[PDB]
Design a protein around this ligand. Structure first.
Ligand code: 9JT
Ligand code: 9JT
Ligand code: MN
Ligand code: MN
Ligand code: MN
Ligand code: NA
Ligand code: NA
Ligand code: NA
Ligand code: NA
Ligand code: NA
Ligand code: NA
Ligand code: NA
Ligand code: NA
Lengths: 274, 275
């Protein structure tokens, strides 16, 4: 059905990850995008080109939204058309540092809804996958979110984000303070949105939240969380929106809503807007 | 090497301990509280510690111990000159309870209050980190070397938020984080265990670790792994590392270490050599 696309997606993700996991051992030319901490390498760009070219060959009618393609001037507008939403390296800062959480993420949407997701954590060798109505898996093991409904026994994942604007940083850290002092059991950060979300899918964390991500950060992993039994929503507590720059990916609505209650929202430019 | 036999035995016991932990992590757990609702312990932490201490006491009856859960049970935390095994049976208990996949057994061995060898077994990953003073650091037999990065603005740091939930204290922790973050650095990561964070520094995958509120057992095994990989340990004041001070910067080099020390406001803590 789309099982053909998905099987293909899994092989491409694995191929891309081999490229990434080969490059990581090599000397790298770190380049900057929007800020001195917003990094990109030729590997990011090479992998995205490879993915888009391979998909274009097999599925010439399909649409793409790719992080580096957007950096090169393409639009981040999601139509109804089958659309591949790619983050060629989610965890570029980790990649640069050889910090061992580096993922290739592919989300596939039709009618603006994700139908399947693939996240390959290539240093770990963990292939996370999910298709709508068919469950979530890591290396074939079927995933289930945790059962925890008590925020004070929760373990959260988040990331401090790409902005270094003091007011923004202070707001991110204030939001972390409020959650931390609920209290919760802990907060962790492995340095990649897609892997943090996959950790929620496995049950090893109870929820992830972040503001400032993009559709390509969340498009592969969000369906892995929901097929593992979890939920997605905006940090505003509103419906999840791939283009809103904000997410809570949680084991369940109770924790998700409890988190949303503490998040001061930071104003963000949508991926679907100028 | 007089201490080499001790170290080889330590590796043995750490792997045994890791097998215990990595079995138990899959199963139902009884999660208990120590000093607060977020300071956790399980029967596995206690069982592993008892196993290690009883095993060491059998081979080295004259040796001393400082073990996290033994201290919880009332033993003294102060390091004497006598050969001392400093044990964290599970560093990453909160991770263990949640099945967050970083959980370590840590054993440091001190003589004359100086660490002579350290063993950290990261059992979910199957990674055995070891170092003997003057003999280098290894992971699964591969020699480790810290990163070469001397520019703080290109550095990746690891830290943890700690066990306190007192707003004042949390604010100082986060303020320290804000200052470093805004230097800026490339990022900060937290995998949930001081020993594993420090072993990430030893491998070069992070450039430096800092934290206040750890204990000697959190850092006794991994500190020499860092230094034998070429790195440095420093107090957050910029002064010499003090194993009983509850504070550490463990970095690839003195340039980054000192640059981090410059931004840290010290939080007040009971030392491990105080009551
Ligand atoms: Se991948 C993953 C993520 C969470 C828990 C377990 C796994 C995993 O690899 N499981 C597994 C896959 C294949 C064979 C044995 C075990
Ligand atoms: O596992 C590692 N190497 C390794 C590779 C092959 C055989 C034995 C060991 C390693 C690499 C980098 C950091 C830490 C480790 Se444990
Ligand atoms: Mn990326
Ligand atoms: Mn403890
Ligand atoms: Mn412990
Ligand atoms: Na990027
Ligand atoms: Na990303
Ligand atoms: Na680095
Ligand atoms: Na990141
Ligand atoms: Na509140
Ligand atoms: Na510990
Ligand atoms: Na949990
Ligand atoms: Na430089």
């Amino acid at each position: 059905p789309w099982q053909e696309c998905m099987d293909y997606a899994v092989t491409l993700a694995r191929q891309a990850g081999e490229v990434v996991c080969e490059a990581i051992k090599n000397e790298m030319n770190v380049m900057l995008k929007s800020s001195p901490v917003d990094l990109v390498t030729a590997t990011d760009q090479k992998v995205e080109k490879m993915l888009i070219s391979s998909i274009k060959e097999k599925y010439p009618s399909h649409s793409f939204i790719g992080e580096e393609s957007v950096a090169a001037g393409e639009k981040s507008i999601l139509t109804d058309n089958p659309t591949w939403i790619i983050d060629p390296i989610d965890g570029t800062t980790n990649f640069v540092h050889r910090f061992p959480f580096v993922a290739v993420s592919i989300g596939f949407a039709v009618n603006k809804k994700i139908e399947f997701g693939v996240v390959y954590s290539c240093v770990e060798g963990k292939m996370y996958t999910a298709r709508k109505g068919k469950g979530a898996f890591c290396n074939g093991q079927k995933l289930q979110v945790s059962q925890q409904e008590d925020i004070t026994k929760s373990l959260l994942v988040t990331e401090l984000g790409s902005s270094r604007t003091p007011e923004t940083v202070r707001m991110v850290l204030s939001n972390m303070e409020k959650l931390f002092c609920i209290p919760v059991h802990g907060i962790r950060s492995v340095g990649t949105a897609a892997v943090n979300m996959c950790l929620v899918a496995t049950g090893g964390a109870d929820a992830y939240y972040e503001m400032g991500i993009h559709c390509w950060d969340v498009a592969g992993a969000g369906i892995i969380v929901t097929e593992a039994g979890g939920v997605l929503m905006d940090v505003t507590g509103g419906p999840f929106d791939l283009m809103s720059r904000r997410v809570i990916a949680a084991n369940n609505r109770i924790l998700a809503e409890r988190i949303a209650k503490e998040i001061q929202v930071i104003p963000l430019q949508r991926d679907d807007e100028d």
